[PDB]
Amino acid sequence: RYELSEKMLSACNLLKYNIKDPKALASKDMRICLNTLQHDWFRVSSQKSAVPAMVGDYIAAFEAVSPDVLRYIINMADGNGNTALHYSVSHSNFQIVKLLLDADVCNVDHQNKAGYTPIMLAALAAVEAEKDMQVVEELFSCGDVNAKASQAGQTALMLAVSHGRIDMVKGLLACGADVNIQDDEGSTALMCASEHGHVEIVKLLLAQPGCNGHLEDNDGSTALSIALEAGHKDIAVLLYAHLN
């Protein structure tokens, strides 16, 4: 079993005594402490080569210091605004994603500096086994699947659709994604699918109760007009059939 270093355990104990005192927590000297925590925590949790048993051992050790110390450390964000949940999703380290979720204190809706949540990162992450998709759907159910990115206001569903990821689209819809959300430019997931020519994804979106094919983007384009213009007459016929 992996154990914290003397220095790390020391920093955890210092946090424990200070965690309830906000202005001490923000003090310049306390920062050297917090930097130790951040450095060692990201070292063990956030590389592609992170070892799940080590992350598990570290989580258990933080909670033994204090549940509040566990909550503080596993929600730390680095200089990129990334949490361990962002990195472990991006790396498709779904055993580690599961350990973080099961600690039951993750803020899954945290936007990194790029403007994206871990649910949005999952929409593009490699998933090589259906069991990994179980962890992805747990993630989807722990946070806000309808959140909009700071860049262009896109949702996870729009991201998945734009990459033609039928698997992710099915997952997101099964976990309650709203098909009708519009990004900052007024585009829907259905419009994204129409641009890319993704026929099966169009059928999946149209099959959702309440899918609104009439929505316009800020220039008055519809999924139907977009499909024709992008040269996807088959989707256009599909859209027409659904709208009428």
Binding site: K113, A114, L121, Q154
Partner: peptide
């Protein structure tokens, strides 16, 4: 338009 653009895994992770 964002709906036409490609976003990469690295673009989601780093600004």
């Amino acid at each position: 338009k964002a709906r036409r653009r490609t976003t990469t895994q690295m673009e989601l992770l780093y600004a």
